[PDB]
């Protein structure tokens, strides 16, 4: 058998509360919103959060890339609630923060989150029109994650008791030293350090921060577009994703001991999986596009499923398939895999 409890997972990211509601076309027009696009909240969207809560159907689900990864991972290991994922981030002790913390803990995540007063809790207006979602994100409190919180006994212990470390690329936009504290911690606990490249702009605008974390990164996870901009960052003039993966194994600095893994998802095409033993492609199940609700956090759901599989000690291929299952399940919205 396996008879295995999952490894304690540490997740750090920018926590946002999805303020989610079906809205009229008039609502999008009112707020200058182009349908199906994700943008950061500007002066043009002033009042949207107060206005989306007028909708009788409005829902509040805890969100943000890394927090959704943590939620999906916990949703797979439901027998281990409070005993599996710890999430670190920065909220505010406002009403958006309470719902976020309280709805994430209830699902089984230990929320070792900071409470700042310098900004309100991070939130995302999820504007639904049929099966189309228009996103308006306000980073807020999430960006104010402090060295003080990372020193705090709660986070240090959370890290000390963890064996798997997942960081979204967005953590590098805040403060690299927070990430580098966990990088050192993964060395100490002999744990495993995983990044998600999260977005192309990370490799373009925050390349210095990424480069300081790469030697410590055991598993690099990205999609085709994130993978390609990585090659652009590295000066690898190629659009062959598998080639990029193999060079990310041996041509990107790695001082770790567990071994460098590179996972590149390719939406409709097979997931590239690379190690020091060569490149391998894991085909993604064929899907009907008239059954896709939205590709929102499909990469987050892949990463959530991939984690829960690694935490129970499944092999790398098995983890990619567990990622596929969860990704496509969340695409079409207890486990059955
Ligand atoms: C163009 C304009 C601004 C820019 O800076 C950014 C810097 C950071 C972010 C960002 C987004 C983000 N999240 C948090 C997790 O959910 C997904 C979105 N965390 N950090 C977004 C934009 C990059 C490119």
Author numbering: 0 to 332, 340 to 343
Paper text:
The overall structures of both TbrAK in complex with AP5A and compound 1 contain a mixed fold and consist of 12 α-helices and 14 β-strands that form two distinct domains. A common property of adenosine kinases from various organisms is their control via substrate-inhibition to prevent non-physiologically high intracellular purine nucleotide levels, and recently it has been shown that TbrAK activity is strongly inhibited by its substrate adenosine.
TbrAK in complex with compound 1 adopts an open conformation, and the location of compound 1 was unambiguously identified by its well-defined electron density localized in part in the adenosine binding site in the adenine moiety binding area, but pointing away from the ribose binding region towards the solvent. Moreover, only this orientation satisfies a number of hydrogen bonds to the protein, supporting the conclusion that compound 1 binds to TbrAK with the phenoxyphenyl moiety pointing towards the outside and the morpholine being buried in the active site. The phenoxy moiety of compound 1 interacts mainly via hydrophobic contacts formed by F169, F200, F204 and F205. As compound 1 is not strongly interacting with the lid domain, it is most probably not able to interfere with the hinge bending motion to close the lid domain.
